Amino acid sequence: MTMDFSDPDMEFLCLTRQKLMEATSIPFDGKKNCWVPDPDFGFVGAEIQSTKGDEVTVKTDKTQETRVVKKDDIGQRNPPKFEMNMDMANLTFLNEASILHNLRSRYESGFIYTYSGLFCIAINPYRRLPIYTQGLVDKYRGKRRAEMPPHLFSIADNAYQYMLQDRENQSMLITGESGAGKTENTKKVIQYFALVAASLAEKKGTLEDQIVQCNPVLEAYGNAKTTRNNNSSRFGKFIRIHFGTQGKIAGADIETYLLEKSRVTYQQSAERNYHIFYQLLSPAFPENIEKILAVPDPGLYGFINQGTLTVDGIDDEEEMGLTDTAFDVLGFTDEEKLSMYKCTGCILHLGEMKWKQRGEQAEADGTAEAEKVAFLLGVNAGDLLKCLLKPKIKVGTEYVTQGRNKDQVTNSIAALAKSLYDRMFNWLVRRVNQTLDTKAKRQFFIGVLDIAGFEIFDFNSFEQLCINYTNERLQQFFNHHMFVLEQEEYKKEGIVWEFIDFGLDLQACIELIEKPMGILSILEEECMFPKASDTSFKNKLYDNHLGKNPMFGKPKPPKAGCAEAHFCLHHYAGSVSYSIAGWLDKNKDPINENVVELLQNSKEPIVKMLFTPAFQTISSVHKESLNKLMKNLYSTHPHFVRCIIPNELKTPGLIDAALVLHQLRCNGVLEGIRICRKGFPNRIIYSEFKQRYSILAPNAVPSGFADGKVVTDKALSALQLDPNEYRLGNTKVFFKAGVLGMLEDMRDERLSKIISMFQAHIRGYLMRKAYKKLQDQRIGLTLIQRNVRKWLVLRNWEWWRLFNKVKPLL
Amino acid sequence: RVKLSQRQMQELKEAFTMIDQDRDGFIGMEDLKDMFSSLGRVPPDDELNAMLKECPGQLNFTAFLTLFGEKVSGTDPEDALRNAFSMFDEDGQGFIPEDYLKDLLENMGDNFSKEEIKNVWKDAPLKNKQFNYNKMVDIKGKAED
Amino acid sequence: SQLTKDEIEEVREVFDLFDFWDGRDGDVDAAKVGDLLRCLGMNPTEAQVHQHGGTKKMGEKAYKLEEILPIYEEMSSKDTGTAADEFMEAFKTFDREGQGLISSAEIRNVLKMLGERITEDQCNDIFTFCDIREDIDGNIKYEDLMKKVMAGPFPDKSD
Ligand SMILES: Nc1ncnc2c1ncn2[C@@H]1O[C@H](COP(=O)(O)OP(=O)(O)O)[C@@H](O)[C@H]1O
Numbered sequence A: 001m002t003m004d005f006s007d008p009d010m011e012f013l014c015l016t017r018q019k020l021m022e023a024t025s026i027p028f029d030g031k032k033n034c035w036v037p038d039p040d041f042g043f044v045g046a047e048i049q050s051t052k053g054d055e056v057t058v059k060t061d062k063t064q065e066t067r068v069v070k071k072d073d074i075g076q077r078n079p080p081k082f083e084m085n086m087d088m089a090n091l092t093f094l095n096e097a098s099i100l101h102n103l104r105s106r107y108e109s110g111f112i113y114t115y116s117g118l119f120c121i122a123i124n125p126y127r128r129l130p131i132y133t134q135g136l137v138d139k140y141r142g143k144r145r146a147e148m149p150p151h152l153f154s155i156a157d158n159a160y161q162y163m164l165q166d167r168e169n170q171s172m173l174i175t176g177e178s179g180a181g182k183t184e185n186t187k188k189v190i191q192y193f194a195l196v197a198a199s200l201a202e203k204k205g206t207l208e209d210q211i212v213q214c215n216p217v218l219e220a221y222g223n224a225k226t227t228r229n230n231n232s233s234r235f236g237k238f239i240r241i242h243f244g245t246q247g248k249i250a251g252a253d254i255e256t257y258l259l260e261k262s263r264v265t266y267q268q269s270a271e272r273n274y275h276i277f278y279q280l281l282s283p284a285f286p287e288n289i290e291k292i293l294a295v296p297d298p299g300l301y302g303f304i305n306q307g308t309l310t311v312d313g314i315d316d317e318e319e320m321g322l323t324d325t326a327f328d329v330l331g332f333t334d335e336e337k338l339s340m341y342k343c344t345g346c347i348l349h350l351g352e353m354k355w356k357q358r359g360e361q362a363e364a365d366g367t368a369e370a371e372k373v374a375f376l377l378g379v380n381a382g383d384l385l386k387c388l389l390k391p392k393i394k395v396g397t398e399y400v401t402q403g404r405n406k407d408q409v410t411n412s413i414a415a416l417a418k419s420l421y422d423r424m425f426n427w428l429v430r431r432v433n434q435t436l437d438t439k440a441k442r443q444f445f446i447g448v449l450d451i452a453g454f455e456i457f458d459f460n461s462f463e464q465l466c467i468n469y470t471n472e473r474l475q476q477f478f479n480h481h482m483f484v485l486e487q488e489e490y491k492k493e494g495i496v497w498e499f500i501d502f503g504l505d506l507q508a509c510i511e512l513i514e515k516p517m518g519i520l521s522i523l524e525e526e527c528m529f530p531k532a533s534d535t536s537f538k539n540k541l542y543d544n545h546l547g548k549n550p551m552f553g554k555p556k557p558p559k560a561g562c563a564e565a566h567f568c569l570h571h572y573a574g575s576v577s578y579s580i581a582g583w584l585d586k587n588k589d590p591i592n593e594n595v596v597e598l599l600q601n602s603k604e605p606i607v608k609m610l611f612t613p614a615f616q617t618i619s620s621v622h623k624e625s626l627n628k629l630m631k632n633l634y635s636t637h638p639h640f641v642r643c644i645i646p647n648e649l650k651t652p653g654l655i656d657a658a659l660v661l662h663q664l665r666c667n668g669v670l671e672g673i674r675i676c677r678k679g680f681p682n683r684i685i686y687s688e689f690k691q692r693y694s695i696l697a698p699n700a701v702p703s704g705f706a707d708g709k710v711v712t713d714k715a716l717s718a719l720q721l722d723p724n725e726y727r728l729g730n731t732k733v734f735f736k737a738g739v740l741g742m743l744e745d746m747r748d749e750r751l752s753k754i755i756s757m758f759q760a761h762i763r764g765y766l767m768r769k770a771y772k773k774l775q776d777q778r779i780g781l782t783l784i785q786r787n788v789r790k791w792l793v794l795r796n797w798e799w800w801r802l803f804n805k806v807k808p809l810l
Numbered sequence B: 001r002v003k004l005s006q007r008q009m010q011e012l013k014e015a016f017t018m019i020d021q022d023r024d025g026f027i028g029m030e031d032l033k034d035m036f037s038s039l040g041r042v043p044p045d046d047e048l049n050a051m052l053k054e055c056p057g058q059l060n061f062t063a064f065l066t067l068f069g070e071k072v073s074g075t076d077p078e079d080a081l082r083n084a085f086s087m088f089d090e091d092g093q094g095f096i097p098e099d100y101l102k103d104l105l106e107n108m109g110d111n112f113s114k115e116e117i118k119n120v121w122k123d124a125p126l127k128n129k130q131f132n133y134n135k136m137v138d139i140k141g142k143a144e145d
Numbered sequence C: 001s002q003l004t005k006d007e008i009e010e011v012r013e014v015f016d017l018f019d020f021w022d023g024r025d026g027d028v029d030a031a032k033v034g035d036l037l038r039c040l041g042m043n044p045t046e047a048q049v050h051q052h053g054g055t056k057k058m059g060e061k062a063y064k065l066e067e068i069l070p071i072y073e074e075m076s077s078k079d080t081g082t083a084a085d086e087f088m089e090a091f092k093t094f095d096r097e098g099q100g101l102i103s104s105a106e107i108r109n110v111l112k113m114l115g116e117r118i119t120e121d122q123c124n125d126i127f128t129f130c131d132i133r134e135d136i137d138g139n140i141k142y143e144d145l146m147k148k149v150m151a152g153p154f155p156d157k158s159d
């Protein structure tokens, strides 16, 4: 249904006028054809054979089987007009059976992108597609969403459009589980505007060239191989692009969230560390290994080798060279660059210092390690080790020295590694935001968002709740946006109707988490009394909230596995069971303030890095930044790209119905549909409606003189339809569910009878014509048939035969 | 159709005239005998005296017309009859097929019975398996072999 | 029943014609019902006939006259008889563009494949007794066909 249905380019967007005439033409019986439940694709098509109470006996579509599902697992199916439906919201029959169907059908044809009302679905192709060529851009430029086929570029664009026409802000929200490719679309969306909008005005970029190189440099540090995705986004991102009236790009600013601090020093069996250590120890830059004082072999480094050392699809030698380029383009000094490596390296050497103790007194062994570690941070060895092994805390009235045992002196060297990265990440973000700030007038912005959706797992700790709380918001910002827009729309058509902002719904979960004395709040207290115990932390929590705020409860168990849970924070997605598992340690950054203070002296980045300018609770900072986002997001037109992972095995065309149908139920896709339904989810534009159901009731009045709204109204009244089922507006007629279903039905069942009638006027023309002939031929015959009989009675009459020869006798 | 006709009557008129020239007295058998004599064959008695009494009193002319009428009530004009046959042939030549004509007079219309469909062949112009319609027509009144 | 003296008169006028060919005897074969109506001017569909008295095979049973009257009556009553409006609405559903034209095959398939299907005969006969021509691009004006089809075969007074 969109511009040159036979464009080579549309090979993955739409079908052909031919191919779609096919899906749409396959048989159907709204009494026989349906949707049923199944073990391997969740649902499958069916033709009802028999019925006996509940024992409905169905023969499926493909298989040829005959199960006997009870009645209720017999889903209603959409008629052929809808096969390949481009926007999920126009389905007369709303159900998972369908939503799933509309989806893989489209998916197994090469169609990843696909709309459903306000949301635009994506499903990881897992394979280069041509969908994103420049020429496609143009084709997609300027157009309202329905003039073209479903595609990121429209959503990217209409966003851009509305930015201009409405002189207001634009936010694009990409979601979905892990490895469902939201970082993939993001840089598309971003790469889009970089062309559409680019301006007209040594080793350095261009404001647009630069907006783009953010990824390399960020990802060489933010991403790392994970079981679900080899290029996992280990963090949240909100980038924002500012446009100057004229509508060109004025600069952008970046926001990052929840850096997984833990892989710095820890890596699961299969997994890996931030792609950058691997890119450094790469053959790509020889001297560089020298400068960060290291040796070409990601194997020797305790902080790197605990899992992999390579990813199925990555050429770490290239990446680096690429990464080293995003630097130059972003305009960083050779020196600034070195500085960002040596730090990366110190994280190597850290994990290579070995300790030994002689009574709670650990001791270096190979000063050799720390010596390097020392040369990177620009401080000094002995002074470093000291702060490390023996520290002078400050017990209120005094500064005491103390003894640190190997476990301690070790655990300590971790934090310092996990702290020096975080710092380094931030400085790196901080340093880009610095180049993406041209300072040129800024009317508005479109801001993109890559971020996990709710992370609900089998074992749930802190880092879990963080993210879950995050989308806990984002979920109501949506529920909000909807409420508004849905109410506005029913005004534009003037259809009386009452609603309710469901964001209110998510308000408990969210308060308890952030309110003055709920979870995170209490977590700040505990986090503050050295004499702090995790057991301590659940006493305060349990106490305050226990059976006193519903959204807080007793955690469910595993078997003798996973581990001990404590309070179940019922959410949006579902409900999670959380682990007190040492959030206090997790939350607050530790670190020999002794070392801290010794660092505040040295070599620069070190300086900026530890040179502050009490609240590092990974949480305080998150609630801080989380807001800075919601203010931004409620100041924008929200736009939703809902990413989806097709299946585990990283494979092209393949639907783990089970998995997919899972996401559909914690995305919000099945919620809009659930909500719309107790509304008029079917909204038809008067013209369109005339062109299709007039046949049900028609007349003599030429079409160009008839008025749409009038037709529709005549067409329904005649049919007897309940007024309950529709609302006729100023521009659309609003229908409940089954309406477009029945209409379609009553229709084909009409067109049929109509053509029979023609063929009945034809069987009447023709029969009438010979009626002429058999009217004549009956005269001929009764003639024959009455003379030939008269004759039989004379050929033997003596008088007669006489008269006969005596006749010529004249 | 039925009970009268101009030429037809006059022909029975002149017809009734070649019979009494064998005497203006309506000189009957004497000339029934004598009118068959100029034709080509010899007739028994009993017929001469039964042929005549198929009529009661006397075969005067008016009456000569009555024995003839009760026998010609449908002898519909010629072309009205030559065309009938034309309707079920529209082949062009002058014929209706045996096979056809047979369903025709026997199944359709005021259905012909076996006894009549039979007689219908004894004298019938059916040579080679077709049927010259312009003859049972010619054999309407009469003409040839 | 509630019919008139004229109509009744009008029904015989045709019945007897029908009787005359199965051999005058005053009974007509049920498969005839269909055609016997098309000549009393109507245009039932087979479905309409079946349900109404029609049968689908020639030795099934014959009706008398006082037996067709009601079959006639009850049927001169349905009024979805089909209007010039409905046909024309239906063909748009095949009018690819809007120019009123329609691929020659396609019309020949609708008529042959869908609804109450028609023989490659009736299908070609009628395109002939209605002179429905293609045009360079080989398409047909569905309105030209509809007007004629519903005109009759004998329009002005003769043929
Ligand atoms: N539309 C697409 N085109 C090309 N490659 C894709 C596409 N979508 C996903 N991928 C691939 O799928 C994997 C998942 O990628 P990613 O976007 O990073 O997921 P997420 O951001 O949700 O964690 C990557 O290896 C990427 O190369």
Ligand SMILES: [Mg+2]
Residues within 6 Å of the ligand: A181, A182, A183, A232, A233, A450, A451, A452
């Ligand atoms: Mg991501």
